[PDB]
PDB file of all heavy atoms in Angstrom:
ATOM      1  N   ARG A   1       3.671   3.939   0.032  1.00 13.54           N
ATOM      2  CA  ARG A   1       3.171   2.824   0.953  1.00 13.54           C
ATOM      3  C   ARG A   1       1.728   2.401   0.617  1.00 13.54           C
ATOM      4  O   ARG A   1       1.441   1.260   0.603  1.00 13.54           O
ATOM      5  CB  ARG A   1       3.296   3.191   2.451  1.00 13.54           C
ATOM      6  CG  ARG A   1       3.028   2.124   3.398  1.00 13.54           C
ATOM      7  CD  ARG A   1       3.215   2.594   4.814  1.00 13.54           C
ATOM      8  NE  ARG A   1       2.650   1.637   5.790  1.00 13.54           N
ATOM      9  CZ  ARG A   1       2.562   1.843   7.040  1.00 13.54           C
ATOM     10  NH1 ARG A   1       3.062   2.872   7.645  1.00 13.54           N
ATOM     11  NH2 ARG A   1       2.000   0.860   7.822  1.00 13.54           N
ATOM     12  N   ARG A   2       0.765   3.460   0.512  1.00 12.11           N
ATOM     13  CA  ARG A   2      -0.554   3.147   0.196  1.00 12.11           C
ATOM     14  C   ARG A   2      -0.639   2.418  -1.205  1.00 12.11           C
ATOM     15  O   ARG A   2      -1.429   1.629  -1.346  1.00 12.11           O
ATOM     16  CB  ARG A   2      -1.365   4.387   0.321  1.00 12.11           C
ATOM     17  CG  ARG A   2      -2.817   4.145  -0.071  1.00 12.11           C
ATOM     18  CD  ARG A   2      -3.718   3.667   1.108  1.00 12.11           C
ATOM     19  NE  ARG A   2      -3.526   2.319   1.347  1.00 12.11           N
ATOM     20  CZ  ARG A   2      -4.068   1.656   2.360  1.00 12.11           C
ATOM     21  NH1 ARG A   2      -4.904   2.288   3.170  1.00 12.11           N
ATOM     22  NH2 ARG A   2      -3.905   0.238   2.455  1.00 12.11           N
ATOM     23  N   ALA A   3       0.133   2.924  -2.174  1.00 16.50           N
ATOM     24  CA  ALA A   3       0.132   2.341  -3.470  1.00 16.50           C
ATOM     25  C   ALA A   3       0.559   0.833  -3.481  1.00 16.50           C
ATOM     26  O   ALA A   3       0.081   0.063  -4.141  1.00 16.50           O
ATOM     27  CB  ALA A   3       0.914   3.241  -4.370  1.00 16.50           C
ATOM     28  N   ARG A   4       1.675   0.633  -2.665  1.00 15.96           N
ATOM     29  CA  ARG A   4       2.082  -0.767  -2.530  1.00 15.96           C
ATOM     30  C   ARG A   4       1.026  -1.614  -1.876  1.00 15.96           C
ATOM     31  O   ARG A   4       0.947  -2.802  -2.263  1.00 15.96           O
ATOM     32  CB  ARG A   4       3.381  -0.828  -1.731  1.00 15.96           C
ATOM     33  CG  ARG A   4       4.581  -0.241  -2.488  1.00 15.96           C
ATOM     34  CD  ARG A   4       5.900  -0.562  -1.746  1.00 15.96           C
ATOM     35  NE  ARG A   4       5.913  -0.190  -0.300  1.00 15.96           N
ATOM     36  CZ  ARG A   4       6.361   0.995   0.021  1.00 15.96           C
ATOM     37  NH1 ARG A   4       6.773   1.876  -0.791  1.00 15.96           N
ATOM     38  NH2 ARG A   4       6.207   1.255   1.307  1.00 15.96           N
ATOM     39  N   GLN A   5       0.395  -1.142  -0.920  1.00 13.94           N
ATOM     40  CA  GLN A   5      -0.709  -1.833  -0.199  1.00 13.94           C
ATOM     41  C   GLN A   5      -1.884  -2.061  -1.152  1.00 13.94           C
ATOM     42  O   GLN A   5      -2.507  -3.122  -1.072  1.00 13.94           O
ATOM     43  CB  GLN A   5      -1.179  -1.153   1.046  1.00 13.94           C
ATOM     44  CG  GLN A   5      -0.226  -1.206   2.198  1.00 13.94           C
ATOM     45  CD  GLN A   5      -0.893  -0.911   3.482  1.00 13.94           C
ATOM     46  OE1 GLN A   5      -2.126  -0.856   3.621  1.00 13.94           O
ATOM     47  NE2 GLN A   5      -0.110  -0.707   4.533  1.00 13.94           N
ATOM     48  N   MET A   6      -2.153  -1.143  -2.112  1.00 12.83           N
ATOM     49  CA  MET A   6      -3.363  -1.298  -2.954  1.00 12.83           C
ATOM     50  C   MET A   6      -3.019  -2.166  -4.127  1.00 12.83           C
ATOM     51  O   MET A   6      -3.903  -2.819  -4.736  1.00 12.83           O
ATOM     52  CB  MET A   6      -3.830   0.093  -3.403  1.00 12.83           C
ATOM     53  CG  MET A   6      -4.391   0.939  -2.260  1.00 12.83           C
ATOM     54  SD  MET A   6      -5.983   0.226  -1.593  1.00 12.83           S
ATOM     55  CE  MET A   6      -6.363   1.496  -0.375  1.00 12.83           C
ATOM     56  N   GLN A   7      -1.776  -2.171  -4.707  1.00 14.44           N
ATOM     57  CA  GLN A   7      -1.480  -2.737  -5.924  1.00 14.44           C
ATOM     58  C   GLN A   7      -1.156  -4.217  -5.686  1.00 14.44           C
ATOM     59  O   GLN A   7      -1.809  -5.161  -6.221  1.00 14.44           O
ATOM     60  CB  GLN A   7      -0.408  -2.132  -6.778  1.00 14.44           C
ATOM     61  CG  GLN A   7      -0.237  -2.456  -8.134  1.00 14.44           C
ATOM     62  CD  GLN A   7       1.019  -3.298  -8.228  1.00 14.44           C
ATOM     63  OE1 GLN A   7       2.096  -2.929  -7.831  1.00 14.44           O
ATOM     64  NE2 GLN A   7       0.903  -4.451  -9.151  1.00 14.44           N
ATOM     65  N   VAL A   8       0.022  -4.485  -4.950  1.00 13.04           N
ATOM     66  CA  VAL A   8       0.413  -5.855  -4.631  1.00 13.04           C
ATOM     67  C   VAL A   8      -0.063  -6.294  -3.254  1.00 13.04           C
ATOM     68  O   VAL A   8      -0.145  -7.586  -3.105  1.00 13.04           O
ATOM     69  CB  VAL A   8       1.959  -5.946  -4.821  1.00 13.04           C
ATOM     70  CG1 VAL A   8       2.318  -5.907  -6.231  1.00 13.04           C
ATOM     71  CG2 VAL A   8       2.624  -4.813  -4.030  1.00 13.04           C
ATOM     72  N   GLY A   9      -0.368  -5.436  -2.369  1.00 10.67           N
ATOM     73  CA  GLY A   9      -0.799  -5.770  -1.052  1.00 10.67           C
ATOM     74  C   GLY A   9      -2.116  -6.510  -1.023  1.00 10.67           C
ATOM     75  O   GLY A   9      -2.459  -7.201  -0.056  1.00 10.67           O
ATOM     76  N   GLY A  10      -2.970  -6.202  -2.064  1.00 11.93           N
ATOM     77  CA  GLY A  10      -4.345  -6.782  -2.139  1.00 11.93           C
ATOM     78  C   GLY A  10      -5.327  -6.126  -1.234  1.00 11.93           C
ATOM     79  O   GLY A  10      -6.345  -6.755  -0.771  1.00 11.93           O
ATOM     80  N   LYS A  11      -5.210  -4.766  -1.119  1.00 12.77           N
ATOM     81  CA  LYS A  11      -6.217  -4.013  -0.250  1.00 12.77           C
ATOM     82  C   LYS A  11      -7.214  -3.311  -1.207  1.00 12.77           C
ATOM     83  O   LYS A  11      -6.803  -2.874  -2.218  1.00 12.77           O
ATOM     84  CB  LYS A  11      -5.423  -3.031   0.642  1.00 12.77           C
ATOM     85  CG  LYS A  11      -4.407  -3.714   1.563  1.00 12.77           C
ATOM     86  CD  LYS A  11      -5.103  -4.806   2.418  1.00 12.77           C
ATOM     87  CE  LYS A  11      -4.102  -5.527   3.191  1.00 12.77           C
ATOM     88  NZ  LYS A  11      -3.261  -4.752   4.070  1.00 12.77           N
ATOM     89  N   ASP A  12      -8.400  -3.152  -0.705  1.00 15.11           N
ATOM     90  CA  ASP A  12      -9.412  -2.516  -1.488  1.00 15.11           C
ATOM     91  C   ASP A  12      -9.289  -0.956  -1.268  1.00 15.11           C
ATOM     92  O   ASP A  12      -8.985  -0.525  -0.221  1.00 15.11           O
ATOM     93  CB  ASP A  12     -10.778  -2.987  -1.131  1.00 15.11           C
ATOM     94  CG  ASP A  12     -11.027  -2.908   0.438  1.00 15.11           C
ATOM     95  OD1 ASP A  12      -9.956  -2.829   1.206  1.00 15.11           O
ATOM     96  OD2 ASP A  12     -12.172  -3.061   0.830  1.00 15.11           O
ATOM     97  N   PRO A  13      -9.572  -0.245  -2.352  1.00 16.64           N
ATOM     98  CA  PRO A  13      -9.467   1.392  -2.187  1.00 16.64           C
ATOM     99  C   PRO A  13     -10.794   1.757  -1.416  1.00 16.64           C
ATOM    100  O   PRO A  13     -11.888   1.411  -1.758  1.00 16.64           O
ATOM    101  CB  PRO A  13      -9.515   1.769  -3.746  1.00 16.64           C
ATOM    102  CG  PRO A  13     -10.219   0.727  -4.533  1.00 16.64           C
ATOM    103  CD  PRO A  13      -9.860  -0.640  -3.801  1.00 16.64           C
ATOM    104  N   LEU A  14     -10.493   2.620  -0.456  1.00 14.24           N
ATOM    105  CA  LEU A  14     -11.669   3.156   0.306  1.00 14.24           C
ATOM    106  C   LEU A  14     -12.460   4.218  -0.463  1.00 14.24           C
ATOM    107  O   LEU A  14     -13.441   4.679   0.145  1.00 14.24           O
ATOM    108  CB  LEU A  14     -11.118   3.690   1.643  1.00 14.24           C
ATOM    109  CG  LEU A  14     -10.240   2.739   2.384  1.00 14.24           C
ATOM    110  CD1 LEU A  14      -9.770   3.378   3.773  1.00 14.24           C
ATOM    111  CD2 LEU A  14     -10.909   1.459   2.672  1.00 14.24           C
ATOM    112  N   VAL A  15     -12.016   4.716  -1.631  1.00 17.27           N
ATOM    113  CA  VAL A  15     -12.752   5.683  -2.384  1.00 17.27           C
ATOM    114  C   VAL A  15     -13.053   5.035  -3.780  1.00 17.27           C
ATOM    115  O   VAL A  15     -12.154   4.460  -4.455  1.00 17.27           O
ATOM    116  CB  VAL A  15     -11.858   6.931  -2.525  1.00 17.27           C
ATOM    117  CG1 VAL A  15     -12.440   7.814  -3.615  1.00 17.27           C
ATOM    118  CG2 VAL A  15     -11.928   7.727  -1.141  1.00 17.27           C
ATOM    119  N   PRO A  16     -14.296   5.204  -4.267  1.00 17.67           N
ATOM    120  CA  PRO A  16     -14.610   4.542  -5.551  1.00 17.67           C
ATOM    121  C   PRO A  16     -13.731   5.192  -6.724  1.00 17.67           C
ATOM    122  O   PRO A  16     -13.782   6.531  -6.965  1.00 17.67           O
ATOM    123  CB  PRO A  16     -16.017   4.839  -5.827  1.00 17.67           C
ATOM    124  CG  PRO A  16     -16.324   5.962  -4.831  1.00 17.67           C
ATOM    125  CD  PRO A  16     -15.404   5.805  -3.673  1.00 17.67           C
ATOM    126  N   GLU A  17     -13.014   4.413  -7.509  1.00 15.99           N
ATOM    127  CA  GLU A  17     -12.125   4.952  -8.478  1.00 15.99           C
ATOM    128  C   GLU A  17     -12.841   5.298  -9.765  1.00 15.99           C
ATOM    129  O   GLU A  17     -14.112   4.939  -9.830  1.00 15.99           O
ATOM    130  CB  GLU A  17     -11.009   3.997  -8.810  1.00 15.99           C
ATOM    131  CG  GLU A  17     -11.563   2.609  -9.231  1.00 15.99           C
ATOM    132  CD  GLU A  17     -10.426   1.545  -9.296  1.00 15.99           C
ATOM    133  OE1 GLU A  17      -9.261   1.778  -8.791  1.00 15.99           O
ATOM    134  OE2 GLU A  17     -10.680   0.484  -9.919  1.00 15.99           O
ATOM    135  N   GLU A  18     -12.242   5.897 -10.604  1.00 15.15           N
ATOM    136  CA  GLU A  18     -12.789   6.424 -11.998  1.00 15.15           C
ATOM    137  C   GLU A  18     -11.911   6.062 -13.094  1.00 15.15           C
ATOM    138  O   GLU A  18     -11.493   7.080 -13.885  1.00 15.15           O
ATOM    139  CB  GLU A  18     -13.100   7.902 -11.848  1.00 15.15           C
ATOM    140  CG  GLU A  18     -14.087   8.385 -10.722  1.00 15.15           C
ATOM    141  CD  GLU A  18     -13.456   8.633  -9.417  1.00 15.15           C
ATOM    142  OE1 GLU A  18     -12.172   8.383  -9.298  1.00 15.15           O
ATOM    143  OE2 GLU A  18     -14.130   9.043  -8.438  1.00 15.15           O
ATOM    144  N   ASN A  19     -11.485   4.870 -13.173  1.00 14.02           N
ATOM    145  CA  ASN A  19     -10.449   4.437 -14.109  1.00 14.02           C
ATOM    146  C   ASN A  19      -9.183   5.141 -13.900  1.00 14.02           C
ATOM    147  O   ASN A  19      -8.679   5.877 -14.743  1.00 14.02           O
ATOM    148  CB  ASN A  19     -10.971   4.573 -15.541  1.00 14.02           C
ATOM    149  CG  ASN A  19     -10.106   3.802 -16.494  1.00 14.02           C
ATOM    150  OD1 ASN A  19      -8.902   4.156 -16.748  1.00 14.02           O
ATOM    151  ND2 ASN A  19     -10.723   2.774 -17.074  1.00 14.02           N
ATOM    152  N   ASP A  20      -8.646   5.046 -12.684  1.00 13.26           N
ATOM    153  CA  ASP A  20      -7.343   5.612 -12.306  1.00 13.26           C
ATOM    154  C   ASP A  20      -6.397   4.662 -11.722  1.00 13.26           C
ATOM    155  O   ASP A  20      -6.803   3.561 -11.253  1.00 13.26           O
ATOM    156  CB  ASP A  20      -7.638   6.820 -11.301  1.00 13.26           C
ATOM    157  CG  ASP A  20      -8.647   7.760 -11.710  1.00 13.26           C
ATOM    158  OD1 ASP A  20      -8.710   8.107 -12.930  1.00 13.26           O
ATOM    159  OD2 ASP A  20      -9.376   8.286 -10.881  1.00 13.26           O
ATOM    160  N   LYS A  21      -5.117   4.919 -11.821  1.00 14.21           N
ATOM    161  CA  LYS A  21      -4.046   4.081 -11.365  1.00 14.21           C
ATOM    162  C   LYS A  21      -4.017   4.068  -9.757  1.00 14.21           C
ATOM    163  O   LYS A  21      -4.868   4.750  -9.090  1.00 14.21           O
ATOM    164  CB  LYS A  21      -2.709   4.424 -11.839  1.00 14.21           C
ATOM    165  CG  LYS A  21      -2.307   3.676 -13.080  1.00 14.21           C
ATOM    166  CD  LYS A  21      -0.860   3.906 -13.441  1.00 14.21           C
ATOM    167  CE  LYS A  21      -0.261   2.826 -14.444  1.00 14.21           C
ATOM    168  NZ  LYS A  21      -0.399   1.499 -13.824  1.00 14.21           N
ATOM    169  N   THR A  22      -3.258   3.237  -9.153  1.00 13.71           N
ATOM    170  CA  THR A  22      -3.173   3.133  -7.781  1.00 13.71           C
ATOM    171  C   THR A  22      -2.633   4.475  -7.135  1.00 13.71           C
ATOM    172  O   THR A  22      -3.101   4.842  -6.039  1.00 13.71           O
ATOM    173  CB  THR A  22      -2.173   2.053  -7.290  1.00 13.71           C
ATOM    174  OG1 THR A  22      -0.823   2.407  -7.541  1.00 13.71           O
ATOM    175  CG2 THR A  22      -2.594   0.738  -8.025  1.00 13.71           C
ATOM    176  N   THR A  23      -1.736   5.147  -7.864  1.00 13.68           N
ATOM    177  CA  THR A  23      -1.183   6.400  -7.326  1.00 13.68           C
ATOM    178  C   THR A  23      -2.209   7.552  -7.192  1.00 13.68           C
ATOM    179  O   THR A  23      -2.303   8.222  -6.110  1.00 13.68           O
ATOM    180  CB  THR A  23      -0.068   6.954  -8.286  1.00 13.68           C
ATOM    181  OG1 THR A  23      -0.593   7.375  -9.468  1.00 13.68           O
ATOM    182  CG2 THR A  23       0.896   5.752  -8.537  1.00 13.68           C
ATOM    183  N   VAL A  24      -3.125   7.660  -8.128  1.00  9.35           N
ATOM    184  CA  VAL A  24      -4.193   8.657  -8.138  1.00  9.35           C
ATOM    185  C   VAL A  24      -5.216   8.425  -7.115  1.00  9.35           C
ATOM    186  O   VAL A  24      -5.476   9.288  -6.274  1.00  9.35           O
ATOM    187  CB  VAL A  24      -4.945   8.747  -9.508  1.00  9.35           C
ATOM    188  CG1 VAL A  24      -5.601  10.067  -9.609  1.00  9.35           C
ATOM    189  CG2 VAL A  24      -3.886   8.731 -10.677  1.00  9.35           C
ATOM    190  N   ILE A  25      -5.623   7.187  -6.935  1.00 10.26           N
ATOM    191  CA  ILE A  25      -6.634   6.895  -5.826  1.00 10.26           C
ATOM    192  C   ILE A  25      -5.938   7.009  -4.438  1.00 10.26           C
ATOM    193  O   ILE A  25      -6.551   7.409  -3.500  1.00 10.26           O
ATOM    194  CB  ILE A  25      -7.167   5.445  -6.061  1.00 10.26           C
ATOM    195  CG1 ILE A  25      -6.183   4.410  -6.047  1.00 10.26           C
ATOM    196  CG2 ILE A  25      -7.889   5.430  -7.379  1.00 10.26           C
ATOM    197  CD1 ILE A  25      -6.665   3.012  -6.287  1.00 10.26           C
ATOM    198  N   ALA A  26      -4.567   6.677  -4.299  1.00 12.14           N
ATOM    199  CA  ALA A  26      -3.913   6.865  -3.013  1.00 12.14           C
ATOM    200  C   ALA A  26      -3.823   8.298  -2.758  1.00 12.14           C
ATOM    201  O   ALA A  26      -4.134   8.773  -1.562  1.00 12.14           O
ATOM    202  CB  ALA A  26      -2.562   6.245  -3.165  1.00 12.14           C
ATOM    203  N   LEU A  27      -3.459   9.152  -3.705  1.00 14.22           N
ATOM    204  CA  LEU A  27      -3.460  10.577  -3.415  1.00 14.22           C
ATOM    205  C   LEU A  27      -4.860  11.189  -3.109  1.00 14.22           C
ATOM    206  O   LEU A  27      -5.036  11.965  -2.229  1.00 14.22           O
ATOM    207  CB  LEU A  27      -2.941  11.286  -4.644  1.00 14.22           C
ATOM    208  CG  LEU A  27      -1.428  11.183  -4.908  1.00 14.22           C
ATOM    209  CD1 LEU A  27      -0.953  11.966  -6.087  1.00 14.22           C
ATOM    210  CD2 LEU A  27      -0.660  11.479  -3.762  1.00 14.22           C
TER     211      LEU A  27
END
């Protein structure tokens, strides 16, 4: 659900990513 919200839902990740996919930042 979080990955769907982040990828196509257009929501910003609450944690700064490090060149990672939506699944990794969601986890």
Side-chain angles (χ1 to χ4, degrees):
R1 182 178 169 187
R2 179 84 280 179
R4 288 192 309 267
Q5 286 201 12
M6 291 297 180
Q7 194 254 314
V8 286
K11 303 304 172 59
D12 48 346
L14 307 183
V15 163
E17 57 190 14
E18 299 87 353
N19 194 291
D20 306 327
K21 266 189 163 300
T22 73
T23 72
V24 194
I25 63 181
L27 288 182

